[PDB]
């Protein structure tokens, strides 16, 4: 199943070291957040949800 949990199941071979977004704001990056992957542009915002 895809996208039904806030955490994921991952094969060990797919794991990578964490990186920060602080020096990569407002530019297109590839992301992998707790198993959810994609491309996008990130900006600091007031918290909602």
């Amino acid at each position: 199943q895809y996208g039904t949990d806030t955490n994921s199941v991952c094969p060990m071979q797919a794991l990578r070291n964490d990186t920060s977004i602080e020096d990569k704001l407002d530019v297109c990056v590839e992301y992998s957040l707790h198993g959810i992957t994609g491309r996008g542009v990130f900006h600091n915002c007031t918290s909602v949800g």
Binding site: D26, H43, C45, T46
Partner: protein, 44 residues
């Protein structure tokens, strides 16, 4: 009395009073011709 149809007499205005009243009752999105790309970059 033709006041409502005339442009009032800083930078000069470009709308009469009645034109102002009409435009204020219509909701139109701003396309941002000058710098809309950066404004959208300021996401919210």
């Amino acid at each position: 009395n033709l006041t409502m149809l005339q442009i009032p007499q800083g930078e000069r205005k470009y709308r009469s009073a009645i034109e102002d009243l009409l435009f204020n009752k219509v909701t139109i999105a701003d396309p941002g011709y000058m710098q809309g790309y950066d404004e959208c970059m300021q996401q919210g």
